[PDB]
């Protein structure tokens, strides 16, 4: 990096995007909702690119990709519900395989249940995660963990004292892509139990990613609970000071530094908006996660112990890495993928004579609870992270 370029990136990473007192968060929220609405109420259909791979084209189905779910035996019914919707809106026409992972062994009744609801030719694989690749490591002082998570539960932080949740966040941050079953894939579509898909997708999504050089796909973009991640930003800035060469000059820096809608988030973390891609859905190019900057960052966070001493989610961790170490024009917003996971929905608008969406979601309604409208970070991403080529992609 040219030293001027780097200094300029470092200056932006060390100041708020908006100066104190030059904005009112209520007016910011209103303008952000209007910008969001202008996008969600725009009639769209499919990406406006000429290279889409249709069902039954020679490249259809040929990406090295899998639908991935980390689930418990007890999630069988809820994951089935998700799978049926993903098949109906997408995968029945493309036939990508499913990979299931669990920290316990899957039962035969789990496997049989999954198979009973899929076509006979659909490939399914089931894997167990080795205990050393899941459990709290020896580096952690369990008694400190207990005391930190006591304090945290008084603040009412969800799952603070659920050890499995900590393990999950860490596994989805830094380990899942090392599981042996995934060594043969370049792409994953992450699927969680109890989600909904609303709109038909008539192109191969992995091939779209590959052909248009996208490393990451998302649908929803949110603020996080700052008390789960008290020191994640400050640690991540220490890592970046030690490895400036990992910075991408076209990183999503404004999105990380936007203090205007939720200034108390930014103050609590001492410099991070807390905006993140909401990873319960994600399309991901595993070559990025396997790359030196991502793996080194993961090691650094492992050493800090914040997966256990705090409640660091996979979503902010993945999102910091993507924003700092990759070109933001490589991160695609799948406007067309109508999708819900409680309590939020991406519900796009179709042309009047289209039957592409099934009508089970209300277009543009992010959430039924207007108090949570200020948890939407999508306006920040639209305003600061999308250039002309992204803005005109739908
Ligand atoms: N195998 C396994 N899966 C887990 C465990 N805890 C969470 N998950 C899965 O990890 C994903 C995220 O967890 P979830 O409970 O949905 O958390 P939330 O979406 O963050 O509320 C989902 O696919 C869960 O099924 C666990 O202890 N074992
Ligand atoms: Mn979930």
Numbering used by the authors: 71 to 464
What does the publication say?
Ktr4p is a member of the Kre2/Mnt1 family of glycosyltransferases. Ktr4p, as the other members of the Kre2/Mnt1 family, is a type II membrane protein with a short N-terminal cytosolic tail and a large lumenal catalytic domain of 40 kDa, which is separated from the membrane by a stalk domain of 11 kDa. Ktr4p, with its large central β-sheet, belongs to the GT-A fold class of glycosyltransferases. We used GDP-mannose as the sugar donor, and tested mannose, α-1,2-mannobiose and methyl-α-mannoside as potential acceptors; in the case of both donor and acceptor this was based on suggestions from sequence identity. Our results, shown in Fig 4, confirm that Ktr4p is an active mannosyltransferase enzyme.
We have formed the complex of Ktr4p and GDP and Mn2+ by soaking crystals of the apo-form, and solved the structure of this complex to 1.9 Å resolution. Both ligands bind in the previously described active-site cleft, which is situated on the surface of the protein, as seen in Fig 2. The most noticeable difference, apart from the GDP itself, is the presence of a Mn2+ ion bound in the active site of each monomer in the complex. The Mn2+ ion in the active site is hexahedrally coordinated. The metal ion interacts with the OE1 of Glu-262 at a distance of 2.2 Å, the NE2 of His-411 (2.4 Å), water molecules 1 and 2 (both at 2.4 Å distance), as well as the O1 of the α- (2.3 Å) and the O1 of the β-phosphate (2.2 Å). O1 of the β-phosphate interacts with the OH of Tyr-229 at a distance of 2.7 Å, and O2 of the β-phosphate interacts with the OH of Tyr-235 at a distance of 2.7 Å. The guanine moiety of the GDP makes hydrogen bonds to three residues of the enzyme via its nitrogen atoms; N1 interacts with OD1 of Asp-173 at 2.7 Å distance, while N2 interacts with the same atom (3.2 Å distance), OD1 of Asn-172 (2.9 Å) and the main chain O of Val-141 (3.0 Å). Only slight changes in sidechain conformation can be observed upon ligand binding in the active site, most notably the position of Arg-142 changes upon ligand binding to free space for the nucleotide base and interact with it via a stacking interaction, meaning the gross structure of the active site pocket is preformed in the proteins apo-state despite the absence of the Mn2+ ion. In the complex structure Glu-262 is coordinating the active site Mn2+ ion via its OE1 atom, while Asn-264 is on the surface of the monomer and is indirectly interacting with the second chain of the ‘dimer’ via two water molecules. Despite extensive efforts to produce a structure of Ktr4p in complex with GDP-mannose, both by co-crystallisation and by soaking native crystals with GDP-mannose, we have not been able to observe the non-hydrolysed state of the ligand, but only the GDP moiety.
